[PDB]
Symmetry: C2
Subunit: 362 residues, 2 copies
């Protein structure tokens, strides 16, 4: 695709600036510099680019309906692409750490960064932190001058914090709230009482909807100076909605999509994750299905995992997903309809994002 | 001490705000809220507070020589204390991750956060990231309104990045630059050719002098609006100097201070760290001392470590430290003398910081 290449060319610009700066203000030798180019390529590239592309889409949207000089068109698109990369670098950061926290094996068809032979956990934690700093380095370099800079950075760190908070929700989801205590070794739940639709939704709201949807949509508005031309409550509500759906597909895919298509290998069952499959399962299963699940869930044993998979198939959980999906389509089309009142171009952007998300295979 | 208590009371304010906000905008249950109060207390408290106190000192300095209304005095001190906590929270973040990367056991007389039974590595990585976000949450809450806010946040992230970059230098210091490669398992150096004074100094410049000295000194100026009344090159140079010395003491203490006085247990020998002791040792030892060191360094074996300790004692490395220290006193007093020309009050601040650093025991 010819817009993908234009986005990626801005990466090459950004990568060059970052690496030049390291050699020239941070006294880095070429081998460490090389290491960081590979760390940036490995953790920032080979994804769908839908977070960053989303910023560009929103910006091109306002550009088609507004008068601008050719140079402003250019600047604005360039700003959109750098903004896009901030979010991709923000994601890279989170995935590096997440793969560590989750015990993952592959991502984008390659081993997870920390599993690289010359990397390891000790380095990966810090590479992760580098990824996050890079995002602030870009912002300050490319946007120091822009009227949207405070707003952009205030949003970004609010989104970053929601995500970290959401991450803490996810990684403690298999613990009984009342037993959770830094002094005491955390035992897994036996009741699964907190695998509810409400709690599931809280987890996913924070760990994924802010950075996956809210941030790119609102950033696209910021770099367009168009935030006053939209109902912000509608934007928040639609980003939460689509973002929840996006995480539901992620959960479904963890268990049911073969790793070669997915580019990563599922770990939710092993990890005892409060995943959409698990919550939906516990919502429809009988007494004997529940008990069989309690005795097999949250263990690396390939045979116990096989059982949970067989339980999930038995429970016919694809019916539940069709119902789920049908309701989300209702509400998304609704919210897009509402967005049309003050901003038809933006609601068209939302519709493209939704379309891409709905039709996803990996 | 009665200024320590006033600083800590601002923590209680900040802690309350952060935790209230979680319950009221982030839907946190009391048990997760509790977990984060203990994580904040454990990682933010029980240290010397010299980074944050340093901001307060600098601010009180400009307040004694300037006319202000009683309310501005108050505001400015409050701002200084919140600024101070940003750096303490920034340090907390770095120590949580560092203890993981370094394989440490204790800090401030308690197990390292990740070694807590109810915490673990998976949670600690993220608690760490929370710590860093808290710093931006404070800034934006307390200072959204202040004229120094861009400057403060631009500096902070520049300092944060230098540190992360310095961390990558430290954790790869026992690798031969030319062998370092993400695809290939990293073998320790056999030559120790990169354990030089120049390389040592580059490591420490980035991993410690920016956040330990540059940031608090410059932040104290920012919240005082007094940055134009100082020679910034002199500030940078003195912060680098004192900060290097501070890391040298840290290295010396790692090996030679008993854990009960230190509050942490040394790991530099085991970890193959490019530490001041190692570099100085390699700088004065004979052919047979060097070879004996090469065969014992970078191994957890208590007996190989015993040997490196015995080699360090043999080499009479406390003479070298006295010479080192005598030269730093020369240059610090020099730089403080220079600081007196445009700003005598600030140079007095620097002198207090230096005095505290020089006379430290843990
Ligand atoms: O590993 P993946 O891709 O399956 C999965 O999506 C990863 C993921 C989702 N949301 C976040 C937020 C921060 C870091 C990682 N995140 P999950 O949430 O299931 O770990
Ligand atoms: O663990 P400590 O206290 O001995 C030691 O000081 C810790 C340390 C120094 N500088 C940094 C910067 C970021 C994180 C940790 N840092 P070291 O550098 O020797 O790990
Ligand atoms: C569910 C979430 C938010 C994590 C998976 O992220 P993506 O599937 O967007 O990862 P890439 O496309 O960037 O590989
Ligand atoms: C050498 C450095 C910079 C790390 C040790 O930091 P401190 O010795 O300042 O840690 P606390 O006083 O905060 O425990
Ligand atoms: Mg994961
Ligand atoms: Mg996860
Ligand atoms: Mg997943
Ligand atoms: Mg350490
Ligand atoms: Mg270290
Ligand atoms: Mg140390």
């Amino acid at each position: 695709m010819a817009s993908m290449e234009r986005f990626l060319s801005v990466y090459d610009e950004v990568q060059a600036f970052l690496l030049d700066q390291l050699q020239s203000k941070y006294e880095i030798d070429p081998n460490r510099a090389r290491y960081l180019r590979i760390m940036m390529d490995t953790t920032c590239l080979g994804g769908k680019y839908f977070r960053g592309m989303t910023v560009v889409n929103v910006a091109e949207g306002f550009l088609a309906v507004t008068q601008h000089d050719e140079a402003t068109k250019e600047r604005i698109l360039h700003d959109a692409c750098v903004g896009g990369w901030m979010i991709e670098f923000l994601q890279a950061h989170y995935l590096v750490e997440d793969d560590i926290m989750d015990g993952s094996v592959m991502r984008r068809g390659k081993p997870c960064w920390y599993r690289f032979p010359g990397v390891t956990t000790q380095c990966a934690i810090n590479d992760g932190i580098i990824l996050k700093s890079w995002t602030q380095i870009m912002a300050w370099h490319y946007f120091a001058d822009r009227p949207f800079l405070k707003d952009l950075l205030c949003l970004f760190q609010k989104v970053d914090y929601a995500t970290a908070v959401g991450q803490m929700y996810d990684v403690t989801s298999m613990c009984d709230s009342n037993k959770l205590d830094p002094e005491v070794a955390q035992p897994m739940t036996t009741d699964f009482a907190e695998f509810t639709p409400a709690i599931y939704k809280r987890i996913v709201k924070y760990k994924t909807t802010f950075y996956t949807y809210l941030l790119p949509l609102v950033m696209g508005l910021f770099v367009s100076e168009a935030a006053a031309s939209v109902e912000m409550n509608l934007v928040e509500r639609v980003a939460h909605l689509i973002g929840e759906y996006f995480q539901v597909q992620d959960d479904v895919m963890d268990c049911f999509t073969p790793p070669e298509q997915l580019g990563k290998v599922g770990t939710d069952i092993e990890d005892a994750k409060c995943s959409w499959l698990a919550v939906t399962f516990l919502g429809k299963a009988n007494a004997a299905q529940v008990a069989e699940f309690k005795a097999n869930y949250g263990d690396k044993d390939p045979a116990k995992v096989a059982v949970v998979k067989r339980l999930y198939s038995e429970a016919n959980l694809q019916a539940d997903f069709a119902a789920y999906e049908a309701e989300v389509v209702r509400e998304v089309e609704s919210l897009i309809e509402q967005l049309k009142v003050k901003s038809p171009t933006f609601a068209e952007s939302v519709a493209v994002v939704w379309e891409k998300t709905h039709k996803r295979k990996k």
